[PDB]
Subunit: 268 residues, 4 copies
Amino acid sequence: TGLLDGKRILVSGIITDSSIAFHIARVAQEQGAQLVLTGFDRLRLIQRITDRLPAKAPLLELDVQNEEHLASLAGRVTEAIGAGNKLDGVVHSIGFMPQTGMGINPFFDAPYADVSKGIHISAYSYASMAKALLPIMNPGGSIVGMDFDPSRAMPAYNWMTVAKSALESVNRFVAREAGKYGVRSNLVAAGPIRTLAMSAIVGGALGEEAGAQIQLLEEGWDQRAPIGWNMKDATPVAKTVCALLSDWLPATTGDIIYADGGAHTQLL
Amino acid sequence: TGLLDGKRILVSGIITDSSIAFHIARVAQEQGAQLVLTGFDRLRLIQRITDRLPAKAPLLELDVQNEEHLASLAGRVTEAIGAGNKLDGVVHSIGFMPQTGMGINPFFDAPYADVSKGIHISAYSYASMAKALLPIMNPGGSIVGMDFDPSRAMPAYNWMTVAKSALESVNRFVAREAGKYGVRSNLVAAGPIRTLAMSAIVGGALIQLLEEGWDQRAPIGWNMKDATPVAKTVCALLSDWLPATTGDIIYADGGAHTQLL
Amino acid sequence: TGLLDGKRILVSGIITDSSIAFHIARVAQEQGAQLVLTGFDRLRLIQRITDRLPAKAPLLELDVQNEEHLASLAGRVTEAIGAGNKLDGVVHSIGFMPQTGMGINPFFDAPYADVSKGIHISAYSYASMAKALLPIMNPGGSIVGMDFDPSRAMPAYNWMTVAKSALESVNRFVAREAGKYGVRSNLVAAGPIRTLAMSAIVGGALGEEAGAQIQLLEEGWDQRAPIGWNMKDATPVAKTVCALLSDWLPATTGDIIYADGGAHTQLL
Amino acid sequence: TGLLDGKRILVSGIITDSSIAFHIARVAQEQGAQLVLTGFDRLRLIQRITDRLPAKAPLLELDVQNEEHLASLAGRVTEAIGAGNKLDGVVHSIGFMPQTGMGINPFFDAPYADVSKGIHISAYSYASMAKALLPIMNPGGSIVGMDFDPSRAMPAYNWMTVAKSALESVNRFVAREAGKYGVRSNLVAAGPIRTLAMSAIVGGALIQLLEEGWDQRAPIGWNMKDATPVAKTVCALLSDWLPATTGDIIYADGGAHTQLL
Ligand SMILES: NC(=O)c1ccc[n+]([C@@H]2O[C@H](COP(=O)([O-])OP(=O)(O)OC[C@H]3O[C@@H](n4cnc5c(N)ncnc54)[C@H](O)[C@@H]3O)[C@@H](O)[C@H]2O)c1
Ligand SMILES: NC(=O)c1ccc[n+]([C@@H]2O[C@H](COP(=O)([O-])OP(=O)(O)OC[C@H]3O[C@@H](n4cnc5c(N)ncnc54)[C@H](O)[C@@H]3O)[C@@H](O)[C@H]2O)c1
Ligand SMILES: NC(=O)c1ccc[n+]([C@@H]2O[C@H](COP(=O)([O-])OP(=O)(O)OC[C@H]3O[C@@H](n4cnc5c(N)ncnc54)[C@H](O)[C@@H]3O)[C@@H](O)[C@H]2O)c1
Ligand SMILES: NC(=O)c1ccc[n+]([C@@H]2O[C@H](COP(=O)([O-])OP(=O)(O)OC[C@H]3O[C@@H](n4cnc5c(N)ncnc54)[C@H](O)[C@@H]3O)[C@@H](O)[C@H]2O)c1
């Protein structure tokens, strides 16, 4: 009776109740999904946060840079959902980039070690998770990652833009591997959403003027989006992710769905 | 239980039970929609076809090159669904290109009158239907058209490739208009499907090699005789589950377009 | 010494001295090219215009909607350049769209008859000219058309945007035909240039604050463009066309070169 | 007379006389450029290769993973062309990916340490060199890097494809910076060319079929054994004849990427 009814889905990337992952988790559960959650580093906090989700779901630790976490991942998921059950869905909502690689910090000044950390967490880990989880996914399954359209450069996004371009390429190759399991792999390219990560970043760049520029970003995005855009609401993005986790897009893989109000299809 | 529960949706393009529009209509009815169908030219023939759909639905004549048909359409639709009710969905699943514009016929030999007719039916008509039906569409509604990825030239598709390129551009402008009504506009780029147009327009102007090639490039495979995955994709767009996508193209092609070999 | 030394190039599209084609013609001549020119309708006026070019050049009438003009073109060109001589280059710098298909006139209110004529002249005729001239082109030859990037919708450009999308598609097919002859076919996507088509034709469709809307277009373009953009200067565009007419892009065909200051590569 | 007469141009990436950089260098010199060359690893062996060039040019050492090399680059480059002289061109023609990231080795088995090294050398180093060399570039100058179209996935190319996607994105940011110096930044996406990297990196990770399919898809054909058309394109970008193109990608692939089949 729900869009994701009877589906077991892993969701990564909850850190705050504003996280896009949190809303993906909320909407999936509203649509009848049974979730496993993964969290990085602050697991007591994430536990308290996810108490506020509609239903109780098991939380597993996963630092995508930790090889041991990746190697034990499938075993721990299987334990969490019960032996014999497989995942129908996997959500990658994970991103990171050192401040040097962001903002008004000069593009040329980011040291490779910083960039490389960012790309490891933001792009490579999409292949890492897929590698760890594909052997426990059902045919008809769906892996989804979060994207921010990096086809053109822009202020501030800097090296994360580069990491997303890498992510887009990784996704196309994940699809080749995933297809062997009858599993789809796609990205959702979202417009700007007022998550705490989003606001910290622009705030890290512009400081005292960050609040104003954020309101201006919202105005510009809403104007260019033919159906408009609400930065305060992650629901449309979360629904798009759930659509890809459902069986209603069975012939789409290696691809990118734009949940950005249609802004990227307009010049002005 | 139903992805499109309660929605009122107009579906154009049904001519046989292999039509992508037929499968779109079937699946939508299965998912709780109520349809109004439109047919070009063969009304008695289409009526027999549509009698095979899981539920009966009113059938309206529509020639997209006929100005009077377009002018009467909204009123005719309202008459069929009852005053005070509006559409939630519109499906544009039509196209045509004269033989000279297709297959092994030389690209340079297609006369403009031929090309022009093809573009009228396959691309302009998307704006035309939108112009006619937007005044009777509900907020949150959705207009969906059928595309075949024309970003790179290819044998056989010739001038229809040009018509599809125009359509994609048209779709982005319809989205600006449709947005004023709170309505989305998108295309589904489908992989090759065994339809009347496939056999009679394309094949008539010349396929097994095409199925194999497409199935190879597609990471999850491709079945030319199964329009259902395409139909489901259109339904996804007609649903409330892709509420932030407009002016866009969704690829229901097995992932073929994301792979070089 | 000259980039196009010894080459024989047909240039269409000159109507005023602000025409992109006029500057393409000037620079080509400065680079040692020998030219044949084509003009539509106002041929006395055009001839007065072309007298201001650095060098003499035959002027032939060509209305791309006139089948008879198209059928006699090769013969009139060959008569102009001498028998046993062929063209090395062809420039299509031709566009048209009735006022109804542009500006603040509603997108839905443009009749297909208006749009169709616009597509005939702006898109289909690229195939027409190629059909007429390919039999009189040397291997190593080059056909170039003028584009305005239509991959995203925008205010005002309206149905001309659709024509340009059609033209891009046509160019990919012309490339397959031209290939047999060892001839390249490409488009130059220029940024906005203050020709009279811009200021008067598009400008006239813009309503009351037309000038301001066009200046705003320039400011936005200059800003997005990493090297900036000057709407008053067609020379970077004319040079780019000449680059495609030269032997220095011998492996590029069916393609688009962006002479737009790099604006299309930047979101903001 | 020469396309690049009096232009001072740095060219990285020569390792054998099949290198794309070697042919870029050869064509630039034929067109009157004064070159400075950089090499990695076996510089004495590279010197033997660079001696085969038309004119003798200074060879400097540059490992792009070496912060000292990068920090001293401009100083050493200035020493080579003379104090008071600046560069007009910079050619980035380098890249690398460990075997684990290539060919028949499973995509999922490449350790990040390996991928990272490949991304560092192949993509980040484009920004690295720009940062080092922009302060000694004249207005009107041109930075060019080599690309292989990564917009779709493909067998064998694997993680290098990902590095190329990074590079394309890096190029767009390098353009923003280079613009402040009146300098252009672009990539050339080349078709397949028989080089040491083609043979040792890609080939050992596994060939003739690649050439045929590319030549078939290219409207003007394509020759894997001929790097000259690619070198010419790079020189076009180094010249004054593409002065309005930046942050972009020019395809020197025989038009292959514009055709489905
Ligand atoms: N907020 C937006 O506007 C926006 C727009 C488009 C795309 N995105 C993408 O959506 C996803 C989530 O972003 P968000 O806006 O919700 O911010 P967020 O801070 O809520 O989510 C980012 C997540 O990455 C996790 N993470 C960081 N390092 C990790 C590691 N080593 N191992 C495992 N997890 C790690 C964090 O703990 C966090 O949960 C990202 O991929 C982001 O780039 C965000
Ligand atoms: N079969 C495929 O492989 C495939 C792949 C991608 C996209 N498409 C697209 O899907 C849509 C439907 O095509 P199909 O494959 O189902 O073939 P089809 O023959 O089953 O449907 C084509 C329809 O166009 C309608 N039509 C033609 N002229 C008309 C007019 N003047 N006014 C109103 N309607 C008119 C026909 O009556 C018919 O029902 C088209 O837009 C087509 O290009 C088909
Ligand atoms: N001005 C810009 O900003 C700009 C930007 C990108 C692309 N373009 C393109 O460049 C080309 C030239 O436009 P322009 O800006 O130089 O304005 P323009 O008016 O000087 O050039 C347009 C030309 O088309 C010719 N033409 C119209 N109908 C014709 C027909 N039936 N047969 C033969 N010729 C015909 C006109 O006579 C004229 O010479 C067009 O294709 C246009 O779309 C212009
Ligand atoms: N050969 C092809 O088919 C082809 C096609 C398209 C694009 N490309 C690209 O063109 C460029 C040249 O490659 P190629 O085909 O000529 O092979 P190549 O082997 O002749 O050149 C590759 C170069 O990378 C250099 N390099 C590796 N690590 C380095 C480091 N740490 N610091 C500085 N330089 C380093 C090598 O020493 C070498 O000279 C590359 O970026 C490549 O990816 C090659």
